[PDB]
Design a protein around this motif. Structure first.
Motif, PDB file in Angstrom:
ATOM      1  N   UNK A   1       0.818  -1.206   0.000  1.00 18.86           N
ATOM      2  CA  UNK A   1       0.000   0.000   0.000  1.00 18.86           C
ATOM      3  C   UNK A   1       0.857   1.264   0.000  1.00 18.86           C
ATOM      4  N   UNK A   2       0.564   2.172  -0.927  1.00 22.39           N
ATOM      5  CA  UNK A   2       1.294   3.434  -1.046  1.00 22.39           C
ATOM      6  C   UNK A   2       0.788   4.425   0.004  1.00 22.39           C
ATOM      7  N   UNK A   3       1.711   5.089   0.697  1.00 21.66           N
ATOM      8  CA  UNK A   3       1.332   6.027   1.746  1.00 21.66           C
ATOM      9  C   UNK A   3       2.113   7.347   1.729  1.00 21.66           C
ATOM     10  N   UNK A   4       1.458   8.422   2.165  1.00 22.14           N
ATOM     11  CA  UNK A   4       2.085   9.740   2.233  1.00 22.14           C
ATOM     12  C   UNK A   4       1.570  10.536   3.444  1.00 22.14           C
ATOM     13  N   UNK A   5       2.445  11.343   4.028  1.00 27.08           N
ATOM     14  CA  UNK A   5       2.079  12.127   5.194  1.00 27.08           C
ATOM     15  C   UNK A   5       2.094  13.613   4.898  1.00 27.08           C
ATOM     16  N   UNK A   6       0.926  14.244   4.933  1.00 33.27           N
ATOM     17  CA  UNK A   6       0.837  15.683   4.703  1.00 33.27           C
ATOM     18  C   UNK A   6       0.696  16.326   6.072  1.00 33.27           C
ATOM     19  N   UNK A   7       1.129  17.572   6.208  1.00 37.26           N
ATOM     20  CA  UNK A   7       1.012  18.238   7.495  1.00 37.26           C
ATOM     21  C   UNK A   7       0.242  19.541   7.352  1.00 37.26           C
ATOM     22  N   UNK A   8      -0.660  19.792   8.293  1.00 32.63           N
ATOM     23  CA  UNK A   8      -1.469  21.000   8.263  1.00 32.63           C
ATOM     24  C   UNK A   8      -0.616  22.266   8.329  1.00 32.63           C
ATOM     25  N   UNK A   9       0.515  22.230   9.030  1.00 33.08           N
ATOM     26  CA  UNK A   9       1.327  23.443   9.115  1.00 33.08           C
ATOM     27  C   UNK A   9       1.925  23.867   7.769  1.00 33.08           C
ATOM     28  N   UNK A  10       1.696  23.063   6.733  1.00 28.11           N
ATOM     29  CA  UNK A  10       2.178  23.392   5.394  1.00 28.11           C
ATOM     30  C   UNK A  10       1.251  24.448   4.803  1.00 28.11           C
ATOM     31  N   UNK A  11       0.070  24.584   5.397  1.00 25.71           N
ATOM     32  CA  UNK A  11      -0.922  25.524   4.912  1.00 25.71           C
ATOM     33  C   UNK A  11      -1.112  26.765   5.767  1.00 25.71           C
ATOM     34  N   UNK A  12      -0.054  27.192   6.442  1.00 26.25           N
ATOM     35  CA  UNK A  12      -0.165  28.403   7.235  1.00 26.25           C
ATOM     36  C   UNK A  12      -0.361  29.544   6.239  1.00 26.25           C
ATOM     37  N   UNK A  13      -1.332  30.410   6.524  1.00 32.60           N
ATOM     38  CA  UNK A  13      -1.645  31.545   5.665  1.00 32.60           C
ATOM     39  C   UNK A  13      -0.442  32.428   5.373  1.00 32.60           C
ATOM     40  N   UNK A  14      -0.512  33.135   4.250  1.00 29.55           N
ATOM     41  CA  UNK A  14       0.544  34.052   3.860  1.00 29.55           C
ATOM     42  C   UNK A  14       0.346  35.333   4.678  1.00 29.55           C
ATOM     43  N   UNK A  15       1.309  35.642   5.543  1.00 27.37           N
ATOM     44  CA  UNK A  15       1.234  36.819   6.410  1.00 27.37           C
ATOM     45  C   UNK A  15       1.526  38.157   5.739  1.00 27.37           C
ATOM     46  N   UNK A  16       0.998  39.227   6.333  1.00 30.35           N
ATOM     47  CA  UNK A  16       1.219  40.585   5.837  1.00 30.35           C
ATOM     48  C   UNK A  16       2.522  41.078   6.459  1.00 30.35           C
ATOM     49  N   UNK A  17       2.948  42.280   6.090  1.00 31.74           N
ATOM     50  CA  UNK A  17       4.173  42.835   6.653  1.00 31.74           C
ATOM     51  C   UNK A  17       3.923  43.094   8.142  1.00 31.74           C
ATOM     52  N   UNK A  18       2.722  43.575   8.443  1.00 30.54           N
ATOM     53  CA  UNK A  18       2.336  43.876   9.812  1.00 30.54           C
ATOM     54  C   UNK A  18       2.353  42.599  10.654  1.00 30.54           C
ATOM     55  N   UNK A  19       1.576  41.608  10.226  1.00 29.37           N
ATOM     56  CA  UNK A  19       1.488  40.325  10.921  1.00 29.37           C
ATOM     57  C   UNK A  19       2.878  39.720  11.129  1.00 29.37           C
ATOM     58  N   UNK A  20       3.628  39.575  10.043  1.00 23.02           N
ATOM     59  CA  UNK A  20       4.967  39.008  10.114  1.00 23.02           C
ATOM     60  C   UNK A  20       5.824  39.737  11.155  1.00 23.02           C
ATOM     61  N   UNK A  21       5.526  41.010  11.386  1.00 22.97           N
ATOM     62  CA  UNK A  21       6.277  41.787  12.365  1.00 22.97           C
ATOM     63  C   UNK A  21       5.952  41.269  13.763  1.00 22.97           C
ATOM     64  N   UNK A  22       4.679  40.942  13.972  1.00 21.65           N
ATOM     65  CA  UNK A  22       4.209  40.410  15.249  1.00 21.65           C
ATOM     66  C   UNK A  22       4.924  39.093  15.536  1.00 21.65           C
ATOM     67  N   UNK A  23       4.872  38.193  14.554  1.00 17.68           N
ATOM     68  CA  UNK A  23       5.484  36.870  14.644  1.00 17.68           C
ATOM     69  C   UNK A  23       6.923  36.890  15.136  1.00 17.68           C
ATOM     70  N   UNK A  24       7.685  37.889  14.700  1.00 20.89           N
ATOM     71  CA  UNK A  24       9.084  38.016  15.099  1.00 20.89           C
ATOM     72  C   UNK A  24       9.184  38.332  16.584  1.00 20.89           C
ATOM     73  N   UNK A  25       8.164  39.014  17.092  1.00 18.12           N
ATOM     74  CA  UNK A  25       8.103  39.370  18.502  1.00 18.12           C
ATOM     75  C   UNK A  25       7.283  38.318  19.267  1.00 18.12           C
ATOM     76  N   UNK A  26       6.909  37.245  18.573  1.00 22.40           N
ATOM     77  CA  UNK A  26       6.120  36.194  19.192  1.00 22.40           C
ATOM     78  C   UNK A  26       4.753  36.691  19.626  1.00 22.40           C
TER      79      UNK A  26
END
Ligand SMILES: Nc1ccn([C@@H]2O[C@H](COP(=O)(O)OP(=O)(O)OP(=O)(O)O)[C@@H](O)[C@H]2O)c(=O)n1
Length: 204
Positions: free
Chosen positions: A28-53
């Motif tokens: 049987x052929x199998x593959x593992x996909x991960x939900x974190x592969x679909x994290x939304x594309x962040x804005x400049x503002x959002x991405x700024x937050x992420x750096x500061x956690x």
């Protein structure tokens, strides 16, 4: 149609290992996909937050649920799809994309894979990985510092401000949907054995 299997649990609970261990025990052929592969594309503002956690990557909206539904749907259709690649050090969707051809079994793992009922109904089987919280935190910390280039203080602050609260509010509640709850995660070979055996029987 392929056999979809949803795998969930809190951060660093070992969802990936459990998926690997299942594949390992399952021709049987199998593959593992991960939900974190679909994290939304962040804005400049959002991405700024992420750096500061200061960004909530544990909220249902942090994911491109729309893209997830489509991608998963097409897989269900036997079509071969493309999958995004996420950079955890830059908090950005990479340009490259990965090809995933048809398979007999498809494992989808992520902290909120059971949240949306649309997606949730695409899974012929759902597993929830349960691991002690201090064990999970410990791993999140080593993984974040190591593999994702982050600071100790940034990690604990993000965890205490977003991860833990989001877990109790969005993640944990989804456990009520699991067909099998796996305490101790990948280390629970007995639970995993029953599972792969169950999967084999359905495929026969
Ligand atoms: N740019 C991002 C995107 C996500 N996350 C964090 O990544 C965690 C979710 O992924 P996780 O489930 O911990 O990793 P997996 O490898 O999918 O799970 P496991 O370790 O159990 O295999 C979330 O808590 C989220 O806060 C982050 O720090 N930075």
């Amino acid at each position: 149609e392929p056999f979809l299997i949803g795998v969930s649990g809190g951060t660093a609970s070992g969802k990936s290992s459990v998926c690997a261990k299942i594949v390992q025990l399952l021709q049987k052929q199998v593959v593992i996909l991960s939900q974190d592969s679909f994290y939304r594309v962040l804005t400049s503002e959002q991405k700024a937050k992420a750096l500061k956690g200061q960004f909530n990557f544990d909220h249902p909206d942090a994911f491109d649920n729309e893209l997830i539904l489509k991608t998963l749907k097409e897989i269900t259709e036997g079509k071969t799809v493309q999958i995004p690649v996420y950079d955890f050090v830059s908090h950005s969707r990479k340009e490259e994309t990965v090809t995933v051809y048809p398979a007999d079994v498809v494992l989808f793992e992520g902290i909120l894979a059971f949240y949306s009922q649309e997606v949730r109904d695409l899974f012929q089987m759902k597993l929830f990985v349960d691991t002690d919280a201090d064990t999970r935190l410990s791993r999140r910390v080593l993984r974040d510092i190591s593999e994702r280039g982050r600071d100790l203080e940034q990690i604990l602050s993000q965890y205490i401000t977003f991860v833990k609260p989001a877990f109790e509010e969005f993640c944990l509640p989804t456990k009520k949907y699991a067909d099998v709850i796996i305490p101790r995660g990948a280390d629970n070979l007995v639970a995993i054995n029953l599972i792969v055996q169950h999967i084999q029987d359905i495929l026969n």
